[PDB]
Amino acid sequence: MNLLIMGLPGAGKGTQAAKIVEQFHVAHISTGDMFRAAMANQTEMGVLAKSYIDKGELVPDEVTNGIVKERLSQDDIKETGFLLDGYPRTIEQAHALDKTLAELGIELEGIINIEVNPDSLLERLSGRIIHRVTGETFHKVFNPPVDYKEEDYYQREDDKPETVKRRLDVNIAQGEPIIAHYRAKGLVHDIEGNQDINDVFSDIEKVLTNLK
Ligand SMILES: Nc1ncnc2c1ncn2[C@@H]1O[C@H](COP(=O)(O)OP(=O)(O)OP(=O)(O)OP(=O)(O)OP(=O)(O)OC[C@H]2O[C@@H](n3cnc4c(N)ncnc43)[C@H](O)[C@@H]2O)[C@@H](O)[C@H]1O
Numbered sequence: 001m002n003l004l005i006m007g008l009p010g011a012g013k014g015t016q017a018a019k020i021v022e023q024f025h026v027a028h029i030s031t032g033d034m035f036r037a038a039m040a041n042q043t044e045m046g047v048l049a050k051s052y053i054d055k056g057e058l059v060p061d062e063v064t065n066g067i068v069k070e071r072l073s074q075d076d077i078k079e080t081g082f083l084l085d086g087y088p089r090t091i092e093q094a095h096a097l098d099k100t101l102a103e104l105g106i107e108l109e110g111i112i113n114i115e116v117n118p119d120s121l122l123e124r125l126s127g128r129i130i131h132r133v134t135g136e137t138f139h140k141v142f143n144p145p146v147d148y149k150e151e152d153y154y155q156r157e158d159d160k161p162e163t164v165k166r167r168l169d170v171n172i173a174q175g176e177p178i179i180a181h182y183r184a185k186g187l188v189h190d191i192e193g194n195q196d197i198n199d200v201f202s203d204i205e206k207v208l209t210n211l212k
């Protein structure tokens, strides 16, 4: 399956993506994860990305398109399919992506658009805690771990309230035209994101199994 998963910050993309990958073995391509990995290893692009990410701003299109194109061009993608997560994030990236996918013969087959009340997002990101090794995300209220030990968790630097508030403003402005772009193509599946995590997934699982 050639898939995009989309949604505002905190809408549950990563949470759902982890469940999707566990069942379908599509390649999870998360620009967020790619940036944070680079940042942790202090690579050149990581140092660049940090500058934008810590302020809740978009990393420039040029670098972003490049790292996604690089991953999409690998030899596994055509056979296994992929799940693009957090990209495209501007209409410019959408246009760039579409041309690349057509060239590689891996055109999108579906968009999973997770719709969530934006009034819920500040609390979702404020209460987020992340397991170190896996990067599995939890929520101190809505999705807490069974036995919390501090050595296994941390908080994302961009989950500070002021950064979250900036991230929401930036992505609310860019988001609508991208959804419209793919809705026009008949590829969008709107998901009720205002449910329990497992209910959101069961909805997504039904959509994905009904593809092809
Ligand atoms: N293409 C691009 N172009 C330019 N720049 C780019 C870029 N891509 C990335 N960047 C840069 O990198 C930065 C970060 O990108 P990125 O990592 O992609 O941030 P994001 O897009 O905002 O996504 P998030 O990880 O913040 O939210 P999520 O939907 O995955 O939430 P989660 O599932 O963990 O869940 C959130 C929390 O809510 C909880 N939760 C999940 N589901 C539910 C539920 N159903 N009910 C209650 N709580 C829930 C979770 O437990 C968790 O605590 C960007 O700000 C940008 O600077």
Ligand SMILES: [Mg+2]
Pocket (backbone or CB within 6 Å): 013, 014, 015, 032
């Ligand atoms: Mg995520």
